[PDB]
Design a protein around this ligand. Structure first.
Ligand SMILES: CC(C)(C)NC(=O)[C@@H]1Cc2ccccc2CN1
Length: 207
């Protein structure tokens, strides 16, 4: 069937849709289609290109209130600028200086503000199940289900550790810490990366 209304969605509303590039872009919801138990959402992007999308591949073009965001919520967030999908790993608290921690679908982790977040319209029941990379998907499942039990390594600036990159271990140094993230300096390459303190890319977490 062709619908005009479906839950809180209405044909003609402005929305965000996931493109094949895996970045998300503004468009208009031009149709809602049911095929038995299934639903699909036709989006006309602002370049005139059209996609027929599942409801987990559209997001509202507003920032949700704090009380609708949980650990495990499926969101689109500003990725450092593209909009990219992720999972809420932390909500605002004193220890994170009132920010949201996002685990993006590619494994990148970043703190963001409410104004950098958008809610996915029809998330899956197990919100991680549409994470394409299986290693990332399993990590998020474990993290979200185990929460608030979160093993993390306690690290201090100047500390020498081994960090993973491209499947091998590298000599590295902790440059700074920000909440649940650590900025690692790869010593040979002389460049830095922000990494989650519970990541098994930090050899102390792996071992
Ligand atoms: C862009 C980020 C994520 C900082 N990565 C890099 O710049 C990588 C980091 C790295 C680590 C060990 C050995 C070689 C390399 C090459 N550049």
């Amino acid at each position: 069937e062709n619908l005009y209304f479906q839950g809180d969605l209405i044909v003609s509303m402005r929305i965000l849709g996931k493109k094949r590039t895996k970045t998300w872009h503004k468009g208009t919801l031009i149709a809602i289609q049911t095929v038995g138990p299934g639903k699909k959402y036709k989006v006309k992007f602002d370049n005139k290109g059209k996609s027929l999308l599942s409801g987990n591949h559209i997001a509202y073009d507003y920032h949700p209130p704090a009380d609708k965001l949980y650990v495990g919520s499926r969101v689109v967030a500003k990725y450092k600028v593209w909009l990219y999908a992720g999972i809420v790993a932390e909500t605002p608290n004193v220890k994170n200086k009132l920010r949201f921690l996002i685990f993006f679908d590619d494994g990148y982790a970043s703190y963001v503000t409410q104004s950098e977040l958008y809610p996915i319209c029809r998330p899956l029941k197990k919100t991680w199940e549409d994470i394409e990379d299986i290693s990332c998907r399993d990590f998020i499942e474990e993290y979200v289900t185990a929460y608030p039990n979160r093993p993390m390594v306690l690290l201090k600036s100047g500390q020498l550790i081994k960090t993973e990159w491209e499947g091998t271990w590298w000599k590295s140094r902790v440059e700074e810490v920000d909440g649940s993230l650590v900025r690692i300096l790869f010593l040979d390459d002389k460049r830095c990366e922000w990494i989650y303190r519970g990541s098994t890319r930090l050899e102390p977490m792996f071992s």
